[PDB]
């Protein structure tokens, strides 16, 4: 099909909302921005961004409105357009995110990435 | 690393240029738009878009400035913002494109996708 080999499930859109993150799960006190797409009518959180390079865990509500915690891969860094300013932003994908979903986040921010 | 399990190679940016496509390689007479990213300092063509739903083969120049042909997966369709108009656009990934690279194209156009 459209996505190829073992196919299958196509993700829709990239959205943004606040969340919290920390250097461990007991300390998610750093407000951050998370990226999520929709797969089979359900939200899937893919990545978070932050000025902080030391984050290890993110937290947010799930579909059922419950508070959950997810592990983070080590961060990529980018220079991103923020107004007339350029800032260093750390981008953390969530542990075990699908490759196509990782790409979707990268695609969504490419317009705004000016250093890498 | 940042992209996880068997890692590895991170794609950079999504760019756009004209190319040609057709229902077979001998007949690539349909001007189309291709999407490409950069991987290891080299351009990688990932997808083409077209109003035509019957395309099977795309053609363009490679890094070495040579004319090549690539097979297309079957197309996804989208309604895309084009000015004040909304149009049906067929999006074809190129045979065997990496999942993360497919996602990057989807991410890049998500801003502009209004039906799916």
From Swiss-Prot, chains A, B:
Function, in words: Forms a primer, NSP9-pU, which is utilized by the polymerase for the initiation of RNA chains. Interacts with ribosome signal recognition particle RNA (SRP). Together with NSP8, suppress protein integration into the cell membrane, thereby disrupting host immune defenses.
Coiled coil regions, renumbered to chain: none
Residue ranges of every copy of the Nsp9 ssRNA-binding domain listed in the record: 6-116
Name of the gene: rep
Protein name in UniProt: Viral protein genome-linked nsp9
Subunit structure: Homodimer.
Annotated compartments: Host cytoplasm, Host perinuclear region; Host cytoplasm; Host endoplasmic reticulum
